[PDB]
Symmetry: C5
């Protein structure tokens, strides 16, 4: 008879998966949750959904599952499936997936003192508010919320593990990630019933360099072409074709931006404002060309276009 099998049989002789591990009803169970983010899978701005891959550390004491190590040949720790032992109900409150199931959560560690540890590796797809006021490059703070959904603070008191809680670098594909300090706070949706929760913040700064040559370069080139457009002679039979080419190009760029850029509700993106400015400027330039004393009007239009361009550039540097 194996000692480990005997210990497992004795420990779980009469155990249920729906009994809170507390010796008395008055007593409470302490659960420490640590959210570690390893890799940032992606962040869809159209859906405002951040997908990341990282494991979560759960630690809770248990008055049961306790044995003297010397009795069982000096055994220290054991591995037990999560199904049998009691499992605290911790769920991401801002979860976005249809179902919330850990990819690898079939094992947990039990010590002789009763400190039950769980490290279920999981893929977290959560919601995050994105501020797209400036979109050459942005940096948003996304908060992941953990805690019980039906256990009040009087039953389980979620906490944090201060050990090894120092800030450290997070691997990212095109986003530089900084791990913010985690905090805890209580929601109160009913009198005499407060539910604790842990909020962990992650600050992501965009580092992609392709967006500069896909969203800014064509727009600035179209603006430069529109600026050069008034220099064409009115009677050269080329202003109309040049304006048609500019309008087709800016329409194509607008279509590409609509296909790529999301439908932000708060504020229009700076790229969208630049595209609208180039659209209106090319339209007015085409109107002046088709209408065409004339030299002074053309000079005034060129000056207005130049001042608009310099204002746009200084604003871009201001939000750069």
């Amino acid at each position: 008879m194996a000692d480990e099998k005997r210990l497992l049989k004795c420990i779980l002789h009469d155990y249920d998966t729906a009994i809170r591990p507390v010796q008395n009803v008055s007593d409470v169970v302490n659960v420490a949750l640590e959210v570690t983010v390893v890799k940032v899978i992606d962040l869809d701005e159209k859906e405002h959904v951040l997908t990341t891959n990282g494991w979560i550390y759960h630690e809770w004491n248990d008055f049961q599952l306790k044995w003297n190590p010397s009795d069982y040949s000096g055994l220290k720790k054991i591995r037990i499936p999560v199904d049998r032992i009691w499992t605290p109900d911790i769920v991401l409150f801002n979860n976005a997936d249809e179902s919330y199931r850990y990819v690898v959560d079939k094992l947990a560690v039990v010590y002789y003192t009763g400190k039950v540890m769980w490290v279920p590796h999981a893929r977290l797809r959560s919601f995050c508010v994105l501020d797209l006021s400036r979109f050459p490059f942005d940096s948003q703070m996304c908060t992941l919320v953990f805690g019980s959904w039906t256990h009040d603070v009087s039953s389980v008191n979620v906490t944090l593990r201060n050990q090894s809680k120092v800030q450290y670098m997070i691997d990212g594909k095109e986003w530089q990630v900084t791990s913010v300090q985690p905090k805890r706070y209580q929601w109160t949706y009913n009198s005499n019933e407060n539910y604790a929760g842990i909020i962990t913040g992650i600050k992501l700064k965009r580092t992609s360099i392709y967006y500069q040559y896909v969203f800014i370069m064509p727009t600035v080139l179209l603006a430069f072409l529109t600026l050069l457009m008034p220099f064409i002679p009115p009677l050269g039979k080329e202003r109309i074709t040049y304006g048609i080419g500019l309008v087709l190009g800016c329409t194509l760029l607008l279509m590409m931006l609509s296909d790529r850029m999301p439908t932000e509700l708060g504020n229009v993106p700076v790229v969208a404002a630049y595209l609208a400015y180039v659209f209106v400027m090319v339209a007015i330039n085409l109107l002046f060309a088709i209408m065409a004393l004339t030299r002074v009007i053309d000079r005034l239009l060129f000056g207005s276009f130049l001042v608009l361009t310099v204002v746009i550039t200084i604003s871009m540097y201001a939000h750069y």
Copy 2:
């Protein structure tokens, strides 16, 4: 021996998951359902499908699961998995997903008086009739239906929880949400068999600002260019190229709208009507230019185009 484990064993000594919690066959079970919508995930107009993330509150009395709190060390409430206790069959009648399963519905609260509470967090993807008569910005009322699918009113009588039933703001990404008062009504698909149901209305008003610069700005610019087109001299060798550019631009815009706009059956969108108007106007302008006394005909065509444009603008303001 833990008191909680003893209470759980005694309560569920002989209990089935298919027995309605009623003391007599004549008696009925009252179930109160409250539908709370937290965030509006999205609303696809092409599929007419509204996806939202919100929890649902179920409250039903049970003659079983009753105990004296003083006996079990003054215990007040307990947490039990939904699998063991009886679960009322409440399903969204207008559900759109292949399967209807709550993301987090593995726990429920049982009080000493027997009032069983359930708060299964779920992601509801339902159907909603969308009126796209005016599409610069719309506001539709979407109704979510809850209730039993095989339990008649004689078995379970769905109701509403008037407590804290006041209207309140709902978080939204690009839609402003107002929570309508919920009502109840009975379907009758067979004589002597009426099934109750709860209908909750949500009024969503669009707040996206990008659609103005992606659907209206290019169309109005093309219309303005078409208006300016007749001013070109007939013999300037530029009307044909200008018309070709306009037709290419409007064709590209039509392609973009077809890729973006859904295939509405009721009425054509106002943007589609505007695009058709600009198409026909540019076509007739190109025909007049290629055909080209002439001055009076051109003036009449310009007047007709101007009156059409002013009628379109006044209609747009009317539905604005």
Copy 3:
């Protein structure tokens, strides 16, 4: 002791889920199936797959599950999970999804006489042959097949419920739906082994109005422009640019149609034929323009183009 629990225990004292409810091997079990379609979710022509949301009514007699109502306090009907009682194996033979599972099929009704009823709400994604000979607007008959997959007629004899079998309107987004009468017929894949099946027909007529302005309007406008093209003077230095614009526009329309229209195998769509006609006509017009006594040749080409256009229009009205 609750009467309902006692009745449920007595009825299912020794019951299996793999035993056909028949008193003798010679006897057979009658199953009545009614397929009701509530909403037509969509119909993808590229995959030829029709997705609909509707419930299915199953009614089968059972010599077991029978009790005297007076004994159990006059109880009339009971609700039982589908897992315990025997379930006839009815599956859509033309099913297209990877798995065939009802969304809400966890409950069934049992009467005192033994008439077991089941109403599992389900989402049916089936195959349908689409005739795309005429595609301004079409109307196809799609057949849904129900029945056993391994139960022969000697075991289960599928039938129809003539009660309330009258034709009625079906809700649709962009398709008008008519419910055809359902029939039954027997497949014979082996001698002395015939399997019954129920075929229900649904006639869907397209009602979308956006396809007229996305598939027909640009094509007819390009055809009109090509018709007007020969009127341009040969020496005006504008025929070549006009032809280039027309060819670019028709190429863009062809790309849009390829992205939208499926790859039909039977016959080419009428829109595709119209696009091919406009392509060849614009190509020949460009060839004649570049080649350019000349007046008579141009008049003959214009006459041929006009007769081709009138033939196309009369054919379109014929299939309209």
Copy 4:
């Protein structure tokens, strides 16, 4: 007491789902597998994945599950769920889906002699090598492999059912399907351990007619326009615009082909070669036009273009 229930209880009094139905360890179990393909769902060339809908016939003898029919009221055959009786492990070796589960495989037939039959309807999404050397229309042979994954030939000897094994037509949407004769062969990944497998071939010939007007018609029209291009006078101020239009059109066609055509590794498609040829020809024509004794050079260029076009046409007919 029902006779069928008594027979089912007696047959499965002590039965396991992990015991091979063999009376002795030396003896082996014969399994006959027949792969029948009903409909070809699709064949994605980009992923090289063929999805089809067809049922599979399994027949294996069992020394258990045997009874005298006369004892049980002359019962002949019974239906039993696949979970209880032993199930041979037959899996498509070239399966492409994440999971391999039959859609409807919950029932099987047991005869009095012990011949266990199984007809699990399934949707097979397998891999197939596609030869895209000629892509106006192709015809590939796709092989589906069935057999055990951990059972050697010494345990289960897969075979074929020669009865009704004649070639017959297979329904297809846009592919004509011919059922090839199935064969068996043994893999040997370890000495003294050979695993049998059944390979069934299906020959599919493309029948789509839309690809001719979406991939060949625009290319041939662009080639014809490029051929006509040299006839334009050098000083007509139209060669440059015509070349620009041709290059824009061929670029759009290349974009469409890239979006549609997959990234074949073996050989470039014939359509891609034709597009490259038209690209290079239009580029050289534009270079000659911009550079522009001249008449002889233009005649030589026209002759070279004509000979290249005739070579391309004869090659196309050769692979046609």
Copy 5:
């Protein structure tokens, strides 16, 4: 009574699925893992995710499951479901899918000596760092990591099977695959707790030929057209239209590249740099043309363009 059934009953008389197969707590269990990759399904650069189809070989000794073959009629090996026998927890640490479940892992081999073998066929979708510094054709080394997630080295010591560990060819669709030697190394996330892991490297070199004609050919043709552009006479009334055509073509190519090319963060692709160079060159050429002693300036611009083109070509050959 079948001998095999008796052996299976005797072996698993009292066995648990959560007991490590070790005779003593001090002793450890050796597990040998071999990762074999058969086919490379694909490698998405946008997500940096490599999907492959290959089986994994697990071999672990067991002090239990041991019997004398002579007793049970000389039986050598048996097949047992993975559910009953103990299963080592081996999971891909860099897994990308939501869930990690083997497609076919329902069987395992048990020998008389106790050497338990498992060959669960699986589809591995892992993460891989992609170096896109040069993108005419690349070759990346992707590492797959296997090992325990909660078992330390003191419990299970993962190793490698040196038998038949020679390098061999791997089938690929458009990637040539070389199998690198596998190694083992230990992670240490806590003192006195080291977890072993096996890293297997696969070197993939791109072999697709379509990317040359979709990403390089249009870019080089546009560059050649831009080079030829300065040769146009300033007063020919064709420089403006030629520049408009070039800018439209390069904008379309940029849109296609943005739709196809991923958003790399490390370095911009060489194709993107080439497109930016052609954009800036065509813009400056258009500026010089519109501005237009002049001959010397045009010659200097042509020389600068030629030297830039030759530098780009020599760099491309350097990274070719």
